[PDB]
Backbone:
């Protein structure tokens, strides 16, 4: 058992609250633009063991995600006596709802099994990743782990949950992170907004099942207007969406029922998504990604 490699995507809650739990409405999909890579290497004779975390771009480390706990556990459970070099690379900012804790956990578990030479089933990965999230981060995310592992959208509604077929919408989504204090720039009559996104998640499920990009655009714009109608809004965020639309975004909303971990903008084609990115970065957007929606 000498060397093991694992990868994971992130995830986005297109519509629905942050850290959603079963029983609450949501639509989560894989975030293929976000990548976490873990490498576990056995070393020789007598070298020190190391854990190295590489963060790409000017993003902060995810301090709440305690990877040292995952490695300690892995070394003790498997009676590993040899020096290990563990490397984690991440594309994802912390605490923006991009599925960072779950991504690290899925990547780490994959790497672990690959290292031990062990076969890894989906349900086994699901169980081990959910357990690793609990240990490393203090709670699992069932929706994030299932969306990530399956590579399929997961839909929550009322008293049931389903895994849909692979995402296929003929279009693009620009994902914007508004950045930082060290703590993230995230954000009563809010109950009625959450009540309303419930019905919007129901329409989104059918819209996604039938590959209707225009209708998802409608739903995004309805979500946003509903939020703004019912809550005190913020000039700097709205101006960023205004800049995205001025540059070809046909729709916009915040993730997490107005928490705003990400801003999501919908574009018809790749060139327009590249134009949105540049205009929004120029206007201060801290980090951006372009997601092909698979059509
Ligand atoms: Cl969020």
Residues:
């Amino acid at each position: 058992t000498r060397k093991g490699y694992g990868e994971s995507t992130g995830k986005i809650i297109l519509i629905g609250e942050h850290a959603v739990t079963f029983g609450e409405p949501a639509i989560a999909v894989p975030f293929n633009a976000g990548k976490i890579k873990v490498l576990i290497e056995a070393l020789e004779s007598g070298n020190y063991s190391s854990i190295k975390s590489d963060v790409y771009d000017g993003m902060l480390y995810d301090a709440p995600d305690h990877l040292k706990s995952l490695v300690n556990r892995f070394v003790e459970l498997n009676n590993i006596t040899e020096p290990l070099a563990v490397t984690i690379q991440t594309n994802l900012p912390p605490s923006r709802g991009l599925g960072s804790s779950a991504a690290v956990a899925v990547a780490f578990v994959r790497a672990s099994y690959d290292f031990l030479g062990k076969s890894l089933t989906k349900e086994e990965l699901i169980e081990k990743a959910n357990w690793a999230e609990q240990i490393a981060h203090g709670k699992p995310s069932g929706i994030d782990t299932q969306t990530i592992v399956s590579g399929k959208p997961v839909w929550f509604q009322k008293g049931h949950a389903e895994t849909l077929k692979t995402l296929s919408l003929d279009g693009y989504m620009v994902v914007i992170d508004t950045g930082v204090s060290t703590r993230q720039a995230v954000h009563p009559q809010y109950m009625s907004h959450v009540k309303h996104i419930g019905k919007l998640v129901l329409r989104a499920s059918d819209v996604i099942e039938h590959h209707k990009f225009e209708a998802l655009a409608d739903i995004f714009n309805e979500c946003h207007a509903d939020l703004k109608a019912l809550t005190v809004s913020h000039d700097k965020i709205e101006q960023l969406m205004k800049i995205g639309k001025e540059n070809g975004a046909i729709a916009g909303k915040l993730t997490g029922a107005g928490r705003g971990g990400s801003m999501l903008l919908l574009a018809k084609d790749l060139p327009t998504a590249k134009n949105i990115v540049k205009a929004v970065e120029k206007a201060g957007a801290a980090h951006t990604w372009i997601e092909n929606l698979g059509g």
In short: The CA atoms of residues 177 and 262 lie 5 Å apart. The two ends are 41 Å apart (CA to CA). The helical segments are 67-77, 100-116, 122-137, 142-150, 190-209, 213-230, 235-246, 270-282. The beta strands are 3-16, 26-42, 50-55, 84-90, 154-157, 160-163, 172-177, 251-254, 263-267, 287-292.
